[PDB]
Design a protein around this ligand. Structure first.
Ligand SMILES: [Mg+2]
Ligand SMILES: [Mg+2]
Ligand SMILES: [Mg+2]
Ligand SMILES: [Mg+2]
Ligand SMILES: [Mg+2]
Ligand SMILES: [Mg+2]
Ligand SMILES: [Mg+2]
Ligand SMILES: [Mg+2]
Ligand SMILES: [Mg+2]
Ligand SMILES: [Mg+2]
Ligand SMILES: [Mg+2]
Ligand SMILES: [Mg+2]
Ligand SMILES: [Mg+2]
Ligand SMILES: [Mg+2]
Ligand SMILES: [Mg+2]
Ligand SMILES: [Mg+2]
Ligand SMILES: [Mg+2]
Ligand SMILES: [Mg+2]
Ligand SMILES: [Mg+2]
Ligand SMILES: [Mg+2]
Ligand SMILES: [Mg+2]
Ligand SMILES: [Mg+2]
Ligand SMILES: [Mg+2]
Ligand SMILES: [Mg+2]
Ligand SMILES: [Mg+2]
Ligand SMILES: [Mg+2]
Ligand SMILES: [Mg+2]
Ligand SMILES: [Mg+2]
Ligand SMILES: [Mg+2]
Ligand SMILES: [Mg+2]
Ligand SMILES: [Mg+2]
Ligand SMILES: [Mg+2]
Ligand SMILES: [Mg+2]
Ligand SMILES: [Mg+2]
Ligand SMILES: [Mg+2]
Ligand SMILES: [Mg+2]
Ligand SMILES: [Mg+2]
Ligand SMILES: [Mg+2]
Ligand SMILES: [Mg+2]
Ligand SMILES: [Mg+2]
Ligand SMILES: [Mg+2]
Ligand SMILES: [Mg+2]
Ligand SMILES: [Mg+2]
Ligand SMILES: [Mg+2]
Ligand SMILES: [Mg+2]
Ligand SMILES: [Mg+2]
Ligand SMILES: [Mg+2]
Ligand SMILES: [Mg+2]
Ligand SMILES: [Mg+2]
Lengths: 51, 193, 99, 148, 203
RNA sequence: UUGACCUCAAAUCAGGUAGGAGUACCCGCUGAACUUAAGCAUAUCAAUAAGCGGAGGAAAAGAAACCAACCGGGAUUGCCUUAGUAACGGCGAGUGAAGCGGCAAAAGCUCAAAUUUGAAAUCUGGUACCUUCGGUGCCCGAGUUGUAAUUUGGAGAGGG
RNA sequence: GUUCUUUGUAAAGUGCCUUCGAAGAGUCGAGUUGUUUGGGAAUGCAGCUCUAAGUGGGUGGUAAAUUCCAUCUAAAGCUAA
RNA sequence: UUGACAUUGUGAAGAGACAUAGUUUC
């Protein structure tokens, strides 16, 4: 009966996921964070819907 | 073990509590099964819904009479009135209830009318075992959403005959309180030979 | 009823156009019948009065309904049945020995 | 958690910051609220005046819900009306058409009057009013409608 | 029907007739053994409303249980405990005589199932009962759609688990406020209101 | 003398059933003290442990001698709440539930008491035969001190 | 899905008039004693004494007498999730 | 140990009440 799971505020979860999303633009970060994007078209990467 | 300016807490862990401790580790593993076992019913129970038609019903006590909430079953009265014997209407996925009683017209009719809309928006199949497959709406009470009944307009003319409301509340208050004492002052009033 | 319409008063409550429903018989579980009237009155005459019942009727003759109530109020459950019980007697009295 | 915790810091410190002179034994006071009236009485009286004894009447089988009665002040009142529709009424308000508000249906039991509503007629249905409440309603040119 | 008359008559228990009976009957019951089977029931009307039937496989046993309180069976009175519990003599058994009646017979005829039981007579040493039992092996029953419920294994020794009328009484199961303590059936409901509901996302 | 009937016995009578085990969970009985109270007797630990009886895949509860006091609700179980609240207690230490509301799941019913009385309409068993979890013919038995049909309070019955 | 026997001079459903309408006792209840309960002039349980009624009966969380009102129908029974 | 009540029923003389007819009580 340890406290295993955590209650996170439903609204932060968003502000978090949102913030998380905004950075998957931001060249520098994606780069900084692993990810060989050293030379992809433009950030964000948008491929065809045919994918 | 009294110290500092804290509240006085009353935590009841003096029995052998470590023994009866229900962690719901299986919260997930119950949803799933519940889902899994609802689906099998829909599947089994043919093109029928999962629920029965429940009636409106106004809720008890001071607190909750404001609003009107789904019911138990429909009362031999409503049932009859929308033109079916219960015994049958129990096989048409309606909920009946010999215990509820009808003392409210507005609420009566609502039900009996709500009873109409059902017989309408359904279909029964023949006996014959000839299954003309139709496809199931899952939830009767999804299709027939019990709603709150509006009781006025948004705007109207102001009607001030002048009488405080307050004081007619204050007064009604009195009237009840001395209802008894007044009544003895007539009994006693009549006692005068 | 018809309610005042206000939330305290000598007939509190929201006003509604009323309905009054057909009645239950489970609301007559007490009520007599002519069967049970016969069977009960008849079994009486066979089996008769019991120990207290005897001394109850005599109490009523030689000591009014006041001592008879109070007496039987200790014999039986309590006061109200004691009351209805002495009743039964003035009748068994009036019945036979009287009119 | 365990690594921001102090008991990590006291490691190698003999007495765990519990003291050498008077240690950390089992239950010095007694347990819980023991000696309320005796060795721990300074801390009761002050910090907890009133703790011992008894006042009032008993109520057998009280059930709140009985005494239900949210209170709403004139203070708000206009909040009970949905926003857009609200300006509509503030400008252009008099008899003939003044807005109706079901304080019961909002879920309040009583209206108290906590000062200052605009000079606008409003028709107010509630189960209970303050004498002032209902006064400063009249002041606007609304009236109060009593219900259940 | 004769029954309704029997019904009525047995409510005049201190009636001259009935108490003649009651003394001649009670003395007979005493000269037999304590557990002993009866030919026909002695209250056909009562037996029958408790669910009796005159077809094969319906048994009636008659049994004897002493009155009194339960003497705490401690040696010399000796309690070795606190003194709220020094209780030896004014102590009285949660189950009823009738309950201890049903048990001692249902033990006696394991194979039958106890349906129900009714009071017949007491004296100063004894209350006497007739217990009615059903052979749930016996064919006439199994095919009788009305009783064959009894033939299920979940009614094995219903009289010891307190599932007869009397046990259900004793056990305190009725709806409503006078029975909050016992109704869902005491300990189950205790243990309920004595468990710690800890959820995943602690409320 | 022959024939029953009641009650009671006996068979290595014909066919069956109970026991012991297990016991996490369940229905009961019985029943502590360590402990807390800074001592201790009530209280507390606890309607716990030990001991005893009885079931199941769940058990139990269950279609109201209910909750209420409303504009009333409507079998039972469980969860979220109610609430560490109303109440209990050397009113001390400690205790401590219910009605409502949301949800999960939902499902309803059976007798006794009734004259079939122009027909005991009911049933175990034995047996023969067959389409064998059973069916029919037939005999013995059961049963009127009442086996079926009918009715179960929401009703419902009989005449029209 | 099919296929065969039609269970029937059977069985059930509803509308008006009429007469009725049976409903569980050493129980309910009462006193006492012990127990237990949050239940407080007493929550359930049990033992002994007392022991009903049929416009009755139980409940309505402060004892009683009186008058009402409200609500259900005990003392037998089955049942899935 | 002692009293009340329950098991506990049937006669007879004597006491006790409607207050010197016999249902009731020792
Ligand atoms: Mg706890
Ligand atoms: Mg559902
Ligand atoms: Mg078909
Ligand atoms: Mg950490
Ligand atoms: Mg921590
Ligand atoms: Mg560190
Ligand atoms: Mg440090
Ligand atoms: Mg260190
Ligand atoms: Mg060291
Ligand atoms: Mg420190
Ligand atoms: Mg040290
Ligand atoms: Mg020191
Ligand atoms: Mg206190
Ligand atoms: Mg305010
Ligand atoms: Mg036999
Ligand atoms: Mg001990
Ligand atoms: Mg004690
Ligand atoms: Mg004896
Ligand atoms: Mg409790
Ligand atoms: Mg937390
Ligand atoms: Mg043999
Ligand atoms: Mg065993
Ligand atoms: Mg104990
Ligand atoms: Mg402890
Ligand atoms: Mg310990
Ligand atoms: Mg101590
Ligand atoms: Mg100590
Ligand atoms: Mg000590
Ligand atoms: Mg205790
Ligand atoms: Mg144990
Ligand atoms: Mg098994
Ligand atoms: Mg299951
Ligand atoms: Mg079951
Ligand atoms: Mg019912
Ligand atoms: Mg309910
Ligand atoms: Mg405290
Ligand atoms: Mg406790
Ligand atoms: Mg609910
Ligand atoms: Mg069913
Ligand atoms: Mg009944
Ligand atoms: Mg007591
Ligand atoms: Mg005990
Ligand atoms: Mg008590
Ligand atoms: Mg009273
Ligand atoms: Mg009602
Ligand atoms: Mg049955
Ligand atoms: Mg059951
Ligand atoms: Mg099963
Ligand atoms: Mg003596």
């Amino acid at each position: 009966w340890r406290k295993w799971n955590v209650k996170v505020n439903h609204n932060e979860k968003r502000y978090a996921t949102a913030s998380a999303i905004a950075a998957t633009a931001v060249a520098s970060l994606v780069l900084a964070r692993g990810h060989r994007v050293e030379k992809i078209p433009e950030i964000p990467l948008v491929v065809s819907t045919d994918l | 073990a009294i110290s500092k300016n804290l509240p006085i807490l009353k935590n009841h862990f003096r029995k052998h509590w470590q023994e009866r401790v229900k962690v719901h580790f299986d919260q997930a593993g119950k949803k799933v099964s519940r889902r899994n076992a609802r689906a099998t019913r829909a599947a089994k129970i043919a093109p029928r819904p999962l629920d029965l038609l429940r009636p409106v019903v106004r809720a008890p006590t001071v607190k909750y009479n404001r609003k009107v909430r789904a019911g138990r079953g429909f009362t031999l009265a409503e049932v009859k009135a929308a033109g079916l014997t219960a015994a049958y209407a129990r096989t048409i996925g309606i909920a009946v209830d010999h215990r509820r009683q009808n003392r409210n017209q507005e609420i009566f009719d609502a039900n009996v009318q709500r009873l109409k809309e059902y017989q309408s928006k359904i279909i029964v199949f023949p006996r014959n075992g000839k299954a003309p497959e139709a496809e199931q709406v899952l939830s009767a009470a999804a299709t027939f959403p019990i709603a709150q009944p509006a009781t006025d307009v948004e705007a109207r003319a102001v009607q001030d005959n002048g009488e405080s409301a307050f004081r007619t509340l204050r007064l009604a208050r009195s009237e009840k309180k001395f209802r008894g004492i007044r009544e003895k002052r007539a009994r006693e009033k009549a006692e005068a030979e | 009823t018809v309610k005042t319409g206000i939330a305290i008063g000598l007939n509190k409550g929201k006003k509604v156009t009323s309905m009054t429903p057909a009645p239950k018989i489970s609301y007559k579980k007490g009520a007599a019948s002519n069967r049970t009237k016969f069977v009960r009155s008849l079994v009486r005459e066979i089996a008769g009065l019991s120990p207290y019942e005897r001394r109850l009727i005599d109490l009523i003759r030689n000591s009014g309904e006041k001592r008879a109530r109070k007496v039987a109020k200790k014999r039986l459950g309590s006061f109200t049945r004691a009351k209805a019980k002495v009743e039964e007697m003035n009748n068994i009295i009036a019945a036979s020995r009287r009119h | 958690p365990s690594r921001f915790t102090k008991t990590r810091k006291h490691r190698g410190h003999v007495s765990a910051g519990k003291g050498r002179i008077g240690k950390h034994r089992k239950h010095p006071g007694g347990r819980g609220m023991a000696g309320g009236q005796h060795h721990h009485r300074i801390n009761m009286d002050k910090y907890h005046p009133g703790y011992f004894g008894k006042v009032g009447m008993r109520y057998f089988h009280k059930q709140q819900a009985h005494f239900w009665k949210p209170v709403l002040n004139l203070d708000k009142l206009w909040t009970l009306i949905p926003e857009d529709k609200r300006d509509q009424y503030l400008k252009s308000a008099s008899k003939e058409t003044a807005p109706v508000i079901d304080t019961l249906a909002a879920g309040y039991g009583k209206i108290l009057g906590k000062g200052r509503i605009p000079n606008v007629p409003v028709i107010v249905k509630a189960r209970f009013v303050s004498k002032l409440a209902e006064e400063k309603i009249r002041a606007a040119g609304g009236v109060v409608e009593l219900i259940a | 029907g004769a029954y309704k008359y029997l019904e009525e008559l047995q409510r005049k228990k201190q009636s001259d007739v009935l108490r003649f009976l009651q003394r001649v009957r009670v003395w007979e019951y005493r000269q037999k053994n304590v557990i002993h089977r009866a030919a026909r029931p002695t209250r056909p009307d009562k037996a029958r409303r408790l669910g009796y039937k005159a077809k094969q496989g319906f048994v009636i046993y008659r049994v004897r249980v002493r009155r009194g309180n339960r003497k705490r069976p401690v040696p010399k009175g000796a309690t070795y405990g606190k003194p709220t519990n020094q209780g030896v003599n004014e102590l009285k058994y949660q189950r009823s005589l009738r309950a201890t009646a049903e048990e001692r017979v249902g033990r006696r005829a394991a194979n039958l199932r106890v349906l129900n039981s009714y009071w017949v007579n007491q004296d100063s040493t004894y209350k006497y009962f007739e217990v009615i039992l059903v052979d749930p092996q016996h064919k006439a029953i199994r095919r009788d759609a009305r009783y064959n419920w009894i033939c299920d294994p979940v009614h094995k020794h219903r009289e010891a688990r307190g599932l007869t009328a009397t046990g259900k009484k004793s056990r305190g199961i009725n709806k409503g406020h006078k029975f909050n303590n016992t109704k869902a059936g005491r300990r189950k409901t205790w243990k309920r209101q004595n468990t710690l509901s800890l959820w995943r996302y602690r409320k």
